Curated annotation (Swiss-Prot):
Protein name, as recorded: Cytoplasmic dynein 1 heavy chain 1
Summary of subunit composition and partner proteins: Homodimer. The cytoplasmic dynein 1 complex consists of two catalytic heavy chains (HCs) and a number of non-catalytic subunits presented by intermediate chains (ICs), light intermediate chains (LICs) and light chains (LCs); the composition seems to vary in respect to the IC, LIC and LC composition. The heavy chain homodimer serves as a scaffold for the probable homodimeric assembly of the respective non-catalytic subunits. The ICs and LICs bind directly to the HC dimer and dynein LCs assemble on the IC dimer. Interacts with DYNC1LI1; DYNC1LI1 and DYNC1LI2 bind mutually exclusive to DYNC1H1.
Full-protein interval shown: 3471 to 3503 of 4646
Family: Belongs to the dynein heavy chain family.
Highest taxon above the source species: Eukaryota
Task of the protein: Cytoplasmic dynein 1 acts as a motor for the intracellular retrograde motility of vesicles and organelles along microtubules. Dynein has ATPase activity; the force-producing power stroke is thought to occur on release of ADP. Plays a role in mitotic spindle assembly and metaphase plate congression.
Domain characteristics, as noted in the entry: Dynein heavy chains probably consist of an N-terminal stem (which binds cargo and interacts with other dynein components), and the head or motor domain. The motor contains six tandemly-linked AAA domains in the head, which form a ring. A stalk-like structure (formed by two of the coiled coil domains) protrudes between AAA 4 and AAA 5 and terminates in a microtubule-binding site. A seventh domain may also contribute to this ring; it is not clear whether the N-terminus or the C-terminus forms this extra domain.
Subcellular location per the Swiss-Prot or TrEMBL entry: Cytoplasm, Cytoskeleton
Modified residues (N6-acetyllysine): K10
Disease note: Charcot-Marie-Tooth disease, axonal, type 2O: An axonal form of Charcot-Marie-Tooth disease, a disorder of the peripheral nervous system, characterized by progressive weakness and atrophy, initially of the peroneal muscles and later of the distal muscles of the arms. Charcot-Marie-Tooth disease is classified in two main groups on the basis of electrophysiologic properties and histopathology: primary peripheral demyelinating neuropathies (designated CMT1 when they are dominantly inherited) and primary peripheral axonal neuropathies (CMT2).
Length: 33
């Protein structure tokens, strides 16, 4: 379904930005150990 694909793409973009933020905070934690 097209709606399923669009929702999946939006959720995937959200997860991508979430994991970019998670990698940034992991780098910050590495800087402060």
């Amino acid at each position: 379904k097209v709606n399923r694909s669009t929702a999946l793409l939006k959720s995937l973009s959200a997860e991508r930005e979430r994991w970019e933020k998670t990698s940034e905070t992991f780098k910050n934690q590495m800087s402060t150990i």
